[PDB]
Design a protein around this ligand. Structure first.
Ligand SMILES: Nc1ncnc2c1ncn2[C@@H]1O[C@H](COP(=O)(O)OP(=O)(O)O)[C@@H](O)[C@H]1O
Ligand SMILES: Nc1ncnc2c1ncn2[C@@H]1O[C@H](COP(=O)(O)OP(=O)(O)O)[C@@H](O)[C@H]1O
Ligand SMILES: Nc1ncnc2c1ncn2[C@@H]1O[C@H](COP(=O)(O)OP(=O)(O)O)[C@@H](O)[C@H]1O
Ligand SMILES: Nc1ncnc2c1ncn2[C@@H]1O[C@H](COP(=O)(O)OP(=O)(O)O)[C@@H](O)[C@H]1O
Ligand SMILES: [Mg+2]
Ligand SMILES: [Mg+2]
Lengths: 313, 314, 320, 316, 315, 307
């Protein structure tokens, strides 16, 4: 079938992820090129090998994991996740690194041809760096056939996410020449700066594409609460719907939740825990009573002193 | 069936004392689960992430809670241990499913409605053998989502519909939370990032959105820990006394007396031994010198320590 | 024929002064341990306690002596190790087994008698990884590495059978127990507190749960009282005073220790918290000058008074 | 004469690597002699014969790694890479180093003999040198020596070892020892084992690396040629990518020159060429599949300034 | 013969070592008692006597090793030295322990009895603490017709006297931490086994070293004294050397002082004395044998400055 | 009679160029040593040679023995490492000294012994079969210290040579390279890895800063793993015979001295002279190649080709 254009890929990412427009443009092109190459074959002349990788650099709860998973759905392609930190410091993990492929081949259902089209996301790669574990990924990225893995890994798409908390410093040290501000600094990121961070030149060489994500602002989280197709509010509204009740979040309440999430520095992943808690009591005794609609205000969220308003019929 | 969360918690009250906030959470999580299973996540134009993570000391009631939930809902229940993790390691995880079918009488549907309790998940992740356990957690994570083939008609069961509860003491988690007696308040502030820092993979945590914490030891739990386990203290001591040709007998009141004292010291299961040892120390010392048929431990011997174990001479 | 705990404690009374509670505990622990071994634990499948012991007491309280004496009384091979040497190494894990080879040496290279052996590890509190007295990664590695020994695994010997006794002073442990046992606003005495000791107290101290779980039997030693030390200076067959008198004897001189001097020595020892181990260094210093110019003089006897010891200012009385 | 001659080997290197003629000549002879020895036999003559290990000294992105990989490909020999810094610090210590032999066996299909022929490239050697780390040099040196047990074995003596390093401080010690009078390429050639001992490498380790090859820093024209000439050249790759769209991508010579200049300012070398090109064509590659034009022309004013977008031409 | 009294022992040490009067008193007693024990026997009058090995604690170049050597010399007893650092970090340390015993037998002529009366000095004991060698040292301290060594092990280490020296740089702080609620020496006098425990020495090891002595840092007046007064003083040695040439070598007091000063700047202690003197006399010793002088005079200008050559007097 | 320090240095000047300072020290050290033996005692003037490889250390030792007409023998610390699987490899060098001496006990005691690569013995062991150099210091020290058919080593003069590559650093830290070595003190050698007991036996310390041509030349041809022999083997696999003219060996040494590189700097010089040749050699077929000094010194002309 036809393959979506980078323009289209980016648009569908806008539906699941708020902001981060620059990173999505990058992913859209990197991904499009990847599959566009795979279809034409390894390469035109046998030279490129048809292997491309992406490196996501952004704060925790910025959307890295979401972006990777979302790309997979849009392209109807097997997706698996792994964590670099669980992997780091183990020898057996080099052997369980193949467990990533034994984890992907489970989700692609041993099709192999589907597995090669698949996408793999490695999280917390910055943590492994202070490198032997990195080699494991390099070997992972590469697969050869002389004519447990039937398909070479070179065809599968690798996306590697990390927070790189110290990287922002090493960037500033190199660009310390004249004659917040985190977003501007990430853009200036170069492979050499990742080397100083502790990533081996070998590993970076195979991660040519570099996308940077900004730290979610207040309004960013608010939009994340409502806009995305599977936004928290939507999810809970559906849950309350099964009870025949209508759940409504006042704008001031959503704002109230975002603020709390920023204070925790948890990012977007800490949004659920906050909402779950605000609606805990209600969801508990709701099945016992019959009301028409429930309204959540900022007072019930931030203070947690006030219970949500109940409207009957 | 499908009792309201209010009804569920009240049923938990009869089995476990205290831990009202945890009960409330389990009630909702379970209710939503089965109410959401019937309807299904599909349709309505929305998808739901949807699993519970029990965090409490040893002998707090976690396991008790899991089993009870299943009994109240007339749903097949199966327990598993993270520290057993029993080359491929793939059958280990599949067994859990198979066992669930055996208990379920081989009904594909009832097995989907089943509940599965995983213990020692905290042990798989260590802060500050290890690899076999963490690899199984990745294999375990792979069995919460997606169907699992029947063991080689082959009408297998989708693993997603099954509810998964994971219990763990998480001794080191207490510290990481405070860095990010009266520990309960710290537990409430627990967040998915604290789990990450503890050693839990992000993908796993994301699969366990619901988190329940316990702030008090469970009396019955300890009582059962004293006699039920194969390595139970009571059995260990009855064995020692048996080499002397003596018959050691614990009165139920004595066992309860032991638990209540352990709870007052917040020592937990580990603090049970020091209490039993102290109760039999004098006896064990002058036992090999005298000749009696059996010896009986009563609550008056434990709590007050005033009375010594009753001797029966023959 | 195994000795009843009554008998084991009685013979410990001959070599060790005080610590009656700890001796009762060791007596039971030991008896049960070998009682289990000799009956081959349990045929088929039954449960049996490891019976490993954790000695907790101040320096020079008798921990080492108790361990050594236990072995002698049971005519069983005995070997000592120090947890400090162990810490910090992967190579020391391979050194940990060295403990076993040494046990085999004293054991005549007999595998079964080695299984009967007793192993005492000193300064276990030192390896504990904690903020107090602040390498951590390495010390823990030993706890875990030595932990494997405790359970039991080209000698071919299995350490399960061998009895483990781990001693430590646990200087900080006293505070952590008080912080827990306290009520409202204290505790009578350290000895009274060490009794209230729980595994969770050892946990906060720095010991890992899996390790403590392998040390079920916990014995606690009291700080030897003035009168104990004093007895240790006189009563034992190789008592310090007896050794120095013998020395002064081959000089033709008679050495006399006044009771006030012996008590003066005990007090010094208690202020230094060194226990009995600190006794000799104290006596030595008090007789140093005397022994130096002794072979040059020609007197009948020398009398040690309190004033010579405590003040260290006056010289011993010389009688001609 | 079934084995490739040094002449033959260098020529093959010229296709993958641009410039560094002097280093290529040394590698060619070092390698040829190494295998020439293996085929006849090790120390067959009464006279003691020492295996020749290579030590590549050159700035980052000079071609060190590439040269090592290319050598193995020409000889149809198993090649594995390791990193001095990755192995510098490990709980397992030198035991790990053996695992690299395991890696050589993986590529090798676990053929003992083929692993012998294998080539091993160690990167960032300059890093371990200051110091218990320098002990790892000993563990790494013992490999060069040989007799390490394999997983079954593998004679590390027969295996060829190439050690690459930037040696940023080396330039100074060379000019210091000689007292000297730029001239970087001239100073590197003057390098001696004693300059490396002063750098921090143990004498026993440098003694096992008899062959020393130095690389000049890339010329302005070197980069330009690297962009165009090599079979795996960037321009060729992007042109191919743009061709899948049916579009013809063309780089103005002024543009290639513009790219090289940027790369030199970064000091990144050839490695930083792709990041520069990627950024220039990023926007165009994003919205290209949405529009239909015959060709795109990349000029220097679109690269350097990044101000103007590429020229779009509609073919008819 | 008769055993030398501690009084005698100390006086003999006074001739080879300057100062450290306190340490010498200690060593004198420890040594006397030790050999007085061997002659009488391990057991005396129904009571077992305690072996009194010695631990020397002093700065580098203070006289620890010399003290050890000198003791052996005045007792006419076999002496061997060993270094704790060579042993550590290896499994073959235990074998090297036997190597030390072998060394003692060599100088001893392989006379087992003479070897058991010998003395062994272990240097840099402080370096071994942050310990398995402490276990090996402990065991060694405790005691346990053929041209070859045959029964080399017929000798047990029980009888041998072990002296352990160390600078213990960190020990000075550990002692201060317990006192709080030359000048360094006053801190070292208060040293207790407990302090050595904290330093890294295992309790079982310190219990085998019941005798502890301390040395003071060497003052400038001390170095000057060392240059002239000992029996084997540097000045005396060179004077004897110049004496073979029929020349009289004279050191002016200001010169001896100049040497000391220079020695203190290098902080080598008495060790760096010889190298300073040899350099000052090198040129002179080189061209001496080819000229006829009555005597040669070394002034401070010749030593410290090195600018002027020694004064040459003709006869 | 006995040669004056003046006479001894003069005889050393004819064998080794430069190193005037070390030659003085050795002269006095040796003179005093034998002057103390003569006329009887009434005792260690042992020497420690610190200099780069190819500096003349070994040559100076030999030369001192010949002018004194005294038995001489060399030993290698590296070889003495193992000290033999059984026994002392050390006692072997006293036997060698006696053989050269015809087994005359006295002449042996007058003898001179040179131990090379002492800096190598100083110290993860990783259960290595090879003996620890730290222990070798002891085995070597047992030798220096007199024993007790029977020979006492106290009377024999010991000279220990070494490069001490790391020593230059240690001395700069304690506070160019030539002037630094002059400031060497026993403390530096202890920090290097030499035990205080060993250093105490080596009171005299001499330093060499420049290389000697004769030594370099010898190192190029004599050793069994000599550069010339290695390259000849290489060219031999090609069926070609490689011949180094003596004038070319001398030309190589000069180059190495001018660059103060030392022995390890020789290979880089030879490699550059033969690079082109080895590069296009496998393409042509000739009987032999001849390297002359004009190939080396000027690099002007290419080596001679015989077909
Ligand atoms: N920009 C965004 N728009 C919509 N949802 C988001 C966004 N960022 C994060 N989320 C939501 O929050 C959760 C955590 O985000 P995540 O992808 O883990 O960020 P990171 O990868 O940086 O940790 C996701 O499950 C996702 O649904
Ligand atoms: N209770 C005791 N009875 C007899 N002797 C003792 C006692 N406590 C200590 N000692 C003496 O002190 C020495 C060391 O005691 P030790 O067992 O090491 O105490 P700890 O183990 O607490 O350090 C012994 O050799 C012994 O003679
Ligand atoms: N001399 C060269 N000629 C052609 N391409 C080069 C050259 N040097 C580097 N490159 C390119 O740059 C990238 C990295 O080069 P690399 O071999 O890693 O140099 P180094 O080893 O010094 O880092 C490669 O992908 C390669 O295509
Ligand atoms: N107090 C002293 N009196 C005389 N000579 C000394 C004294 N201290 C050191 N020396 C001299 O210095 C040299 C080294 O002393 P040594 O005892 O080895 O140092 P350390 O105290 O570190 O063991 C010896 O050769 C000795 O002659
Ligand atoms: Mg140079
Ligand atoms: Mg001296």
């Amino acid at each position: 079938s036809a393959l979506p254009t980078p323009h289209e890929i980016r648009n569908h990412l806008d539906d699941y992820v708020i902001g981060q427009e620059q990173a999505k443009k990058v992913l859209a092109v990197a991904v499009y090129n990847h599959y566009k190459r795979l279809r034409n074959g390894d390469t035109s002349n046998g030279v490129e090998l048809g292997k491309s990788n992406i490196l996501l650099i952004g704060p925790t709860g910025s959307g890295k994991t979401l972006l990777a998973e979302t790309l997979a759905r849009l392209l109807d392609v097997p997706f698996t996740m792994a964590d670099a930190t669980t992997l780091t410091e183990a020898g057996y993990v080099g052997e369980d690194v193949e467990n990533i492929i034994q984890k992907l081949l489970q989700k692609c259902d041993y099709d192999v041809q589907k597995a090669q089209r698949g996408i793999v996301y490695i999280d917390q790669i910055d943590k492994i760096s202070r490198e032997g574990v990195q080699q494991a990924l390099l070997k992972l990225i590469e697969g050869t056939v002389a004519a447990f893995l039937q398909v070479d890994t070179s065809k599968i798409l690798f996306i590697c996410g990390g927070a790189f908390a110290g990287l922002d410093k090493v960037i500033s040290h190199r660009v310390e020449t004249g004659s917040a501000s985190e977003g501007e600094l990430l853009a200036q990121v170069e492979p050499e700066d990742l080397i100083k961070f502790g990533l081996i030149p070998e590993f970076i060489g195979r991660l040519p594409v570099v996308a940077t994500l900004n730290e979610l602002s207040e309004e960013a989280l608010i939009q994340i609460l409502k806009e995305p197709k599977n936004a928290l509010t939507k999810q809970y509204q559906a849950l309350f719907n099964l009870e025949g009740v209508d759940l409504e979040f006042r704008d001031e309440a959503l704002d109230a939740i975002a603020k709390k999430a920023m204070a925790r520095k948890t990012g977007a992943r800490g949004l659920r825990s906050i909402v779950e808690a605000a609606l805990l009591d209600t969801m508990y005794d709701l099945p016992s009573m019959e009301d028409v609609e429930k309204v959540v205000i900022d007072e019930s969220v931030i203070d947690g002193q006030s219970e949500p308003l109940l409207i009957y019929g």
